[PDB]
Symmetry: none
Subunit: 139 residues, 2 copies
């Protein structure tokens, strides 16, 4: 049984240009999967202010978060790590930066590497293919 | 220092192709090429086969058709492999893919496989590298 913050809700899968769907498993670990069918990849994205979202994995009940040190992790409770900057890019895809945390005046991104692992935020750049996401409507 | 490699061309790849217009590419029972929003349509399962460096053939497995475009720029399904089935597979800066006719250009400019907003096959000649319609992500099928 899931909840959301006050805001504009939409239901999506997030598929990286590294060709993984983002999921958070029952253990709160954040990974990619090739599985088009995976229920831990169904996300509720709610906009709470302009360009600011909280992304929750419905079927595990975790928020996609990133911490000061720049690790992706799953958070049971909403907190400041769960605020993300959603930038609708260029042509056809989105990026998700830490709202709260920078590295050397550089944004830190949610990214899935080529073997489907989460990246350490310090190593990520907006131009990266790992940090690009084609949202796909769930229903 | 010993390259290690992961995306070298050769081995077949079982994929769907997902347009940025938000449809999966299929070829029906009857060789008609279209997009679906359905995540589980068996006509959207493709076999992508490297024929030469820079060139692929795309085959809808469950209808036994190749994806093709003729000289007149018409995107169609083809039961036998021929030169209209040769496609330049190309990866753009942003990281999505384009598929263009190997043989057929128009105004010197190249012609792309493309699905529009209502997921209809686009007219060869009316496509541009730029176009959201002409961008795909392949997704793995198990």
């Amino acid at each position: 049984s899931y909840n959301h913050l006050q805001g504009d809700v939409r239901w999506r899968k997030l598929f990286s240009f590294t060709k993984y769907f983002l999921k958070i498993e029952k253990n709160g670990k954040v990974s990619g999967t090739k599985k088009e069918n995976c229920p831990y990849s169904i996300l509720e994205i709610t906009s709470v202010e302009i360009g600011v979202v909280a992304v929750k994995a419905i079927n595990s009940n975790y928020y996609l978060a990133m911490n000061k040190k720049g690790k992706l992790y799953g958070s049971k409770e909403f907190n400041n790590d769960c605020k993300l900057k959603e930038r609708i890019e260029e042509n056809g895809y989105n990026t998700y930066a830490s709202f709260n945390w920078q590295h050397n005046g550089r944004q830190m991104y949610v990214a899935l590497n080529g073997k489907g692992a989460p990246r350490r935020g310090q190593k990520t750049r907006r131009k990266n293919t790992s940090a690009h996401f084609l949202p796909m409507v769930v229903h």
